[PDB]
Structure formats: C-alpha cells, structure tokens
Design an enzyme around this catalytic site. Structure first.
Site, short mmCIF file in Angstrom:
data_model
loop_
_atom_site.label_atom_id
_atom_site.label_comp_id
_atom_site.label_asym_id
_atom_site.label_seq_id
_atom_site.Cartn_x
_atom_site.Cartn_y
_atom_site.Cartn_z
N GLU A 134 -7.43 -1.83 8.20
CA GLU A 134 -7.26 -0.66 7.82
C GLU A 134 -8.34 -0.33 6.66
O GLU A 134 -8.88 0.67 6.68
CB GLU A 134 -5.87 -0.52 6.93
CG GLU A 134 -4.72 -0.72 8.28
CD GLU A 134 -3.51 -0.10 8.05
OE1 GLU A 134 -2.79 -0.37 7.16
OE2 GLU A 134 -3.07 1.00 8.68
N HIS A 192 -2.19 -5.53 10.76
CA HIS A 192 -2.54 -4.49 11.51
C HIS A 192 -3.73 -5.34 12.45
O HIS A 192 -4.56 -6.04 11.86
CB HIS A 192 -3.01 -3.37 10.58
CG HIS A 192 -2.13 -2.92 9.84
ND1 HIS A 192 -1.33 -1.77 10.24
CD2 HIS A 192 -1.39 -3.19 8.76
CE1 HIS A 192 -0.39 -1.54 9.06
NE2 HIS A 192 -0.59 -2.46 8.26
N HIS A 248 3.12 -8.47 7.40
CA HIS A 248 2.75 -7.98 8.60
C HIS A 248 1.24 -7.79 9.04
O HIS A 248 0.46 -7.91 7.90
CB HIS A 248 3.60 -6.55 9.05
CG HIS A 248 2.94 -5.56 8.02
ND1 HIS A 248 3.60 -5.37 6.71
CD2 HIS A 248 2.15 -4.55 8.10
CE1 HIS A 248 3.05 -4.34 6.27
NE2 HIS A 248 2.06 -3.86 6.98
ZN LIG Z 1 0.33 -2.62 6.48
#
Ligand SMILES: [Zn+2]
Length: 258
Positions: free
Chosen positions: A104, A94, A92
């Site tokens: 992140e 972000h 996935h």
């Molecule tokens: Zn993640």
C-alpha cells in the site's frame, strides 16, 4: 454492491459510500525519502510482544486477520512518535497478483510484494471501537515484504490458510509469536493518516519500517490462493487487495534516522 477491490467496487468507487476517502489525511502515501524530515526528537520504538496471546485467524472477505487477546497489556507498542500505550489487536497483509505490486505504501514510488499491518489501539480509549473515533486512536506498524529467502516465522500462518480459504471462515490460531515477523532494524518513517479500508477513518499514526522482511515466492503464492468470496459462491482469488497511494496534502513525513 459492497466495497471491494474489483472493477466496479474498488478503491476509485469508495468515496460514494465513504466521503472521507477524499479527506485530508488519507492513507497510504508514497514516502519520498529525500523530502522526509529527520526528527532527532523521535524516540526509538518499544515493541513488547513477549506475552502476546494470539487467538484466531479469520478470512473477512478482504484479507485475513490474526487476532490477539487485547483485554490486557500483553502485546504493546510504545515510544516512537506515540504518547501512551497501544495494544495489539490484529495483524493482516495486503498483497498483489504479481511480485511487483501488493504494498500500500510505496518508497520513492517503489512497490513491494506485500505489506504487513500490525494494528494497535490507544488504551486510554478503552476499546478499539472508541479508539477509531479519535485522531490518536490507532498506531499501525507497517512492514514491507520482498520476495527472496523464506521467513520461517511466517510459515505457521501460511500453513493454516487452507483452513480459511473463503470469506467468513475462522480457525483457532494459538501460540503464534509476532516477533518472528519483525526486521532486524526498527528505523521508521511516521505520518498521520487513516485506515486503508472502509470506513477509512482518520485515526492512525502510521509507523512504517524502513527495512523490509524477505519471504519466499512459495509463501506469497499461498496468500494468492485465498478467496474473496464465501463458500459455494463463484471463486474470486484474493489478490490485489491494496489501496493506491493518496495525496499527501498538508502532511510532513518524519524519519527516525538519517
Ligand atoms: Zn491494512
């Protein structure tokens, strides 16, 4: 009043439902490249993705996951700082509302436009649900995305996102090769950390690749058209689904390269 990324339920609130949010090995962190320690004992990463079997893509309300068949050693990560074999279960991303934020992890406080997480679990624990309860249960390969030239191997993901616009939607997503998302170099930093979403369990060996991949402005724009909400609910664009950097505390980041 579920957790999320909004003003009233975002990362600063998560500790009320998940007290480990204030724990000793939380992720992500800022990678200070000058205080990371080169460790010559670290082995090269071994990424064996040739037999990967992707199954589905799912909007889970906080990101979209591309899920893989993890019932056999088909797509595995070995080597590096790891002992044993870790099976790929999902990846996935972000991302941000703007090109200047979205990752992140940060590198010397620099944010990238997005961050890709390839999530793997240690086969000695038999399933993902048991692995997350162990300090060495998961290995997450983190790859930064910068905006520039398009990444052709990402386009098949981008083109299906219209089908999974809202929370709970899924689509068949077979024959996707995750090798098209890897940079040229596998040099990395590594440190012990956590999941970056609830339940925030401290079960992850992080392997963050030094070299970003480039994606085009049009590719990342399509991520920003997804919705946090379900169909028929008020529209909230899925953007800024990243947790800010957490204190390093008593941890050393190690580098595989000088
Ligand atoms: Zn993640």
């Amino acid at each position: 009043h579920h957790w999320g990324y909004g003003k009233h339920n975002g990362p600063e609130h998560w500790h009320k439902d998940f007290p480990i949010a204030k724990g000793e090995r939380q992720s992500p962190v800022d990678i200070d490249t000058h205080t990371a320690k080169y460790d010559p004992s670290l082995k090269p990463l071994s990424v064996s993705y040739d037999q990967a079997t992707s199954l589905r893509i799912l909007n889970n309300g906080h990101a979209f996951n591309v899920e893989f068949d993890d019932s056999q050693d088909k797509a595995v990560l070995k080597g590096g700082p790891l002992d044993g074999t870790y099976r790929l279960i999902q990846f996935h991303f972000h991302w941000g509302s703007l090109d200047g934020q979205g990752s992140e992890h940060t590198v010397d406080k620099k944010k990238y436009a997005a961050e890709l997480h390839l999530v793997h679990w240690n086969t000695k624990y038999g399933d993902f649900g048991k692995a997350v309860q162990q300090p060495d249960g998961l290995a997450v390969l983190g790859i930064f995305l910068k905006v520039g030239s398009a990444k052709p191997g990402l386009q098949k993901v981008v083109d299906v996102l219209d089908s999974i616009k809202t929370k709970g939607k899924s689509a068949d997503f077979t024959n996707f090769d995750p090798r098209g998302l890897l940079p040229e170099s596998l040099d990395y930093w590594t440190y012990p950390g956590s999941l970056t979403t609830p339940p925030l369990l401290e079960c992850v060996t992080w392997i963050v690749l030094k070299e970003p991949i480039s994606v085009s402005s049009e590719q990342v724009l399509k991520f920003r058209k997804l919705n946090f909400n379900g169909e028929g609910e008020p529209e909230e664009l899925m953007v800024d689904n990243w947790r800010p950097a957490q204190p390093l505390k008593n941890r050393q980041i190690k580098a595989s390269f000088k």
